[PDB]
């Protein structure tokens, strides 16, 4: 492989416990020449970007389409792996080594990524017309595990819908875009499950986001089929990455009382303790920044963590109610990664100002350390994924983050893949 | 099951003798621009600059290169040289598009400048100038640079072979050898590409001067435009580099010098080999005083001749704000963005990427023997084209109406940023009129 630096998770317990410096100066934005050009001049669209880093190795994915952003049937699914290496300035930057594409049909939607020991893993939903229509049509999709490596291998294992192990019955299982982890021959990632409602568990509803939310509206926001009384559940997928014969693939269903709405998300594993942190992406009615800890006890709980009170904005044209089940949607752009084993500190890519310019937000226990735009003007952020890491040994003042985004660079075009890296302040105040 | 070496579309050169001989249709409708998701993102938001883009295609395999810098476009010392290889495969719509398989980077120091590319089978080749501060300062400092041959393949490892300046075999005497960006070809055991050599002036040969580009050109001004060192009486000559790509033991690297009466100024360029006949076509890039689209044929006789071919009378524009003379020595420069590829074994037909309008927007021009078949913008607005490279091919068997072209460019996408790598493909009209 290309000479690469050792890296370690920025949410390690060795992270700062102190109250952090509010970094006033401009950030040092360094290159991240990864991915590919995505037709900035010829109306090509990119969706579902995910970036993951493990010990100086990264894996990247996105979904490319022609002429619009809703063409799963004619989409191309991109996978990429590379290493983080010291650039001419002595700065660790990622560079690609291998790239693969999957040409639909079939399409691959909601791919989750993880990297472990120079190996890359991708879990995708095999589809033709996408998850929204798949649920309404009551399909039972195949799920495909991709195994990638720096020497150019891409192996696939089909997971039939009936093969999943679970303690209860469910209609169907879907993958969702985001970050996962590979631990103990298992690939853990967020998932979505269509399942009939049970009396004991109702929709999470009233809270600081919408104190007067109505329970019937909350249940409707989660419902899939009114006649079948099925609801879209958040889940954790535990996929076998060592066995190809009689593989043990498990789905852990989280009851719908643990989340306002099922969504895409990221899972983080604290290396020393094994605690699982999560970042539940938006796209529903809740405009809160949803992070927390996964606590498996008598059942799987999502213990919410208060990271920031800043709300996720609505699209430009929406003038309806904000942050309540019957109004505007909260955009899907925000993605926050933990800089602390208990998510006391987080760094995220966030939309800023009316054009939703891409920006970086540093928050510690509801204190905003900084909120800085990457660019101004009319550049609009659509989706983002962020991977922050530390060197071995850590820099006493900085961690490094890699941000990948989809952006509307020019009017009349479609969202474009862009990437960048930066030194993330970790100095105490 | 993914795009790979064995699962790729077969292609053939668009300058094959099997190309159309007829008078071509002037294509009025808009072109069908199809994806070319190659290269990488190049920091469109963080002021990163990309230079010297080159694309080459051979039988469904491509190789790409460019030079990346941080914070400015004049930082060889802190630059990164990118290499990439991939295949041309049928996209979901049934359209052949390029997709990357391998990517390599070379971290300065040392930097690698003026890389020329060639592809044969599944192997890729790059010939670069080992430098620290770039060719202009290297010539002024009278350095003798190393030249490095890079060997890449889709399933193999990137190897390098250093060519010392004293190791070159040649029939001529010269001071130093430089590579230049552009396309070359790999045939049999040789990698042929354009080069530049610093050499003392010869009594018999003066600078090419008066012509359709500058009817009133002055011979003294033309000779000055080619001169390197007046004290040493050295001039920058165009050359052809023949580099051994099969032998690791006793490699034979040869320099063929072209006398300075065959070209207005030495420059970067592209070489094309007609597969059936073996004739060599060339595209001499701009960046000097000549604002003509410089194409022609390389004829080795008693000496190496560059037989000019008149492809189009449209002139290459000058940079914004220049009020000196156009297309004549000692005045405004002609921008280096244009790149023209042959669609005909004798360059009767050409397709090029060209700057159009005041912002120098990227555009595609189709010309046949000085007749403009079309001149269409890719985009308008304030997007500015800086450099470009184009590779057009055929599907085997050829589509009766269309060839396929891949265009790679460096563009100023947003004000306050630096030139960005962008790529696109399109169906190139080849139908008769």
Residue numbers in the entry:
A (entry chain A): 198 to 626
B (entry chain B): 194 to 626
Please share text taken word for word from the publication where this structure appeared.
Here, we study the RBP presented on the surface of rodent-borne paramyxoviruses Mossman and Nariva (MosV and NarV, respectively), viruses that constitute founding members of the recently defined Narmovirus genus within the Paramyxoviridae family. Each protomer of the RBP consists of an N-terminal intraviral (IV) region, transmembrane (TM) domain, an α-helical stalk, and a C-terminal six-bladed β-propeller head domain, which mediates the interaction with the cognate host-cell receptor. Crystallographic analysis of the C-terminal head region of the dimeric MosV and NarV RBPs demonstrates that while these glycoproteins retain the canonical six-bladed β-propeller fold found in other paramyxoviral RBPs, they lack the structural motifs associated with established paramyxovirus host-cell receptor entry pathways. Additionally, using an integrated crystallographic and small-angle X-ray scattering analysis, we confirm that MosV-RBP and NarV-RBP form homodimeric arrangements that are distinct from those adopted by other paramyxovirus RBPs.
For structural studies, minimal constructs bearing the C-terminal six-bladed β-propeller head domain of NarV-RBP (Glu184−Pro657, termed “NarV-RBPβ”) and MosV-RBP (Glu202−Thr632, termed “MosV-RBPβ”) tagged with a C-terminal hexahistidine tag were generated. Beyond the β-propeller head domain, the NarV-RBP constructs also included a small C-terminal extension of 31 residues of unknown function, which is not present in MosV-RBP and BAVV-RBP and lacks sequence conservation with other paramyxoviral RBPs. Subsequently, the NarV-RBPβ structure was phased using the partially built MosV-RBPβ structure as a molecular replacement model. Additionally, similar to Mòjiāng virus G RBP (MojV-RBP) and Ghana virus G RBP (GhV-RBP), the C-terminal extension (Asn626−Pro657) of NarV-RBPβ, which does not exist in MosV RBP, was disordered in the crystal. These combined observations are suggestive that disordered N- and C-terminal residues of the narmovirus RBP are intrinsically flexible or require the stabilizing environment of the higher-order NarV-RBP and NarV-F assembly existing on the envelope surface to form an ordered state. The interface between NarV-RBP protomers is similarly substantial, with an occluded surface area of ~2,160 Å2 stabilized by 19 hydrogen bonds and three salt bridges. In contrast, the putative glycosylation site in the NarV-RBPβ (Asn575) crystal structure was not observed. However, given that treatment of NarV-RBPβ with endoglycosidase F1 resulted in the reduction of molecular mass, it seems likely that the GlcNAc at Asn575 is occupied, yet mobile in the crystal. Despite exhibiting only 31.4% amino acid sequence identity, NarV-RBPβ and MosV-RBPβ present similar overall structures, where structural overlay results in a root-mean-square deviation (RMSD) of 1.6 Å over 401 aligned Cα atoms.
